[PDB]
Design a protein around this nucleic acid. Structure first.
Length: 73
DNA sequence: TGCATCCGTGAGTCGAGGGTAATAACCAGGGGGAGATAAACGAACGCTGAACGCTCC
């Protein structure tokens, strides 16, 4: 997700918040590796922050998901 | 102590002119302001004439 109005190092720090979230909600009772669980939370934190901090005029999160959806189609 | 290196600064004058890119995507819940219907008063009207006077027989 580099090169979209957010600095590359800034993306790492916001994703880093997602990682600390994931460890508090992870356990061995599920028969799966930590890597599969973590990547969901990493992607969530990065994409939400990108929605909330890239544009000069802030756009609400649900308008942002509308425009990128229509752009791709 | 001398020699080598790099970093910062400055480099004319007025004229002419405007727009830039890219990636899991959702229920689920739920709060919070922005637009839709009955109650408190007093002011137009309303007939209520009643109650006063203004001319007339």
């Amino acid at each position: 997700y580099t090169g979209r109005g957010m600095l590359f190092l800034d993306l790492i720090q916001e994703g880093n918040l997602g990682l600390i979230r994931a460890v508090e909600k992870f356990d061995y009772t599920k028969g799966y590796k930590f890597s599969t669980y973590a990547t969901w939370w990493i992607r969530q934190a990065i994409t939400r922050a990108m929605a909330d901090q890239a544009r000069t005029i802030r756009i609400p999160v649900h308008m942002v998901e509308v425009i990128n959806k229509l752009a791709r189609v």
